[PDB]
Homo-oligomer: A and B are copies of this chain.
Amino acid sequence: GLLDGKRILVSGIITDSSIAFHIARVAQEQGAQLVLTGFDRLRLIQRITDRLPAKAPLLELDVQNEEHLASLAGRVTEAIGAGNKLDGVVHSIGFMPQTGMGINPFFDAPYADVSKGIHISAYSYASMAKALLPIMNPGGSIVGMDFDPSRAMPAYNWMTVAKSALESVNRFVAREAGKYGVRSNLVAAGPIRTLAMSAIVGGALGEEAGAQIQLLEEGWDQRAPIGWNMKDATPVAKTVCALLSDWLPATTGDIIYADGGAHTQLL
């Protein structure tokens, strides 16, 4: 078991197609003992996580709530038992209001909306690190989820800016985590058909946005030398588990591309 005996906190489950759901599943298959955090609809999240291979304690965490962050370490310790620390943390959280992502023109996003998205999608990575590093073991691992923002693209708009910020945050979190013997890295995944993503392809954010995602999905599988299957999150979940294991011991402040190789190819 790749993660045997490791204690790992996984945020970001909201449905059974959430990337963090599959991260949580693969980690439990590999012997990890999990603690879960969920935002807002905790009864729904509980019913979703009941389908994980093993039962895992669920804690409430709204990343914009200072009280939630201040109590987090104590509530984690209460779930895993005093004297036990975390070996791994998974940040799988993201949000941008509709004004900053979609067919709404890039210039029309109010900063209040953009700021909320950068708060939840980028700053929260440092927030969670700060809350959880004091209860992490040496040799631990923090992993966040990324979507390659080094080039601009239709519709993603302000969320691409939030991703650019998150990659920069990750390189500073790595400097802090290094003082604990802890690594911090991001996994840049290719497009995955989550519920939200499926809703956008169906036009939830405007028809242009939906058409552009479909073109991006299609271009992705074409470019990827090993193909890309947007309906299979297993590859991304296994990559996260790789970074949570002891088998990338010299990688930190970095980005692993679980994208089928698409970013290495022009056409």
Contact = CB atoms under 8 A, between A and B. Distances in A.
Interface of A: 2, 105-107, 111, 114-115, 118-119, 122-123, 126-127, 129-130, 149, 151-154, 157, 160-161, 163-165, 167-169, 171-178, 181, 183, 189-190, 212, 215-216, 219, 224-228, 234-236, 238-239, 241-242, 245-254, 256-261, 263-267
Contact of A252 (B177, B219, B264): B264
A253 B247 contact: no
A119 B129 contact: no
A256 B256 contact: yes
Contact of A267 (B219, B226, B236): B219
Given A161-B168, A225-B175, A256-B256, A265 B126 contact: no
Given A151-B266, A172-B106, A247 B238 contact: yes
A235 B247 contact: no
Contacts of A169: 161
A250 B226 contact: yes
A168 B160 CA distance: 7
26 contacts: A106-B126, A107-B126, A107-B129, A111-B119, A151-B266, A152-B168, A152-B264, A152-B265, A153-B267, A157-B172, A160-B172, A164-B168, A165-B165, A174-B226, A175-B265, A178-B225, A235-B249, A236-B250, A238-B247, A238-B248, A238-B249, A241-B247, A247-B247, A251-B258, A252-B260, A253-B261
B122 A115 contact: no
A200 to B, nearest CB: 15
A176 B107 contact: yes
B254 A250 contact: no
Given A111-B127, A236-B250, 7 more contacts: A115-B115, A160-B168, A215-B267, A238-B249, A238-B250, A250-B257, A254-B264
B264 A174 contact: yes
B225 A252 contact: yes
B253 A152 contact: yes
A249 B264 CA distance: 15
A62 to B, nearest CB: 13
A258 B267 contact: no
Nearest to A174: B225
Interface centre among A105, A164, A266 (most CB of B within 10 A): A266
Contacts of A154: 267
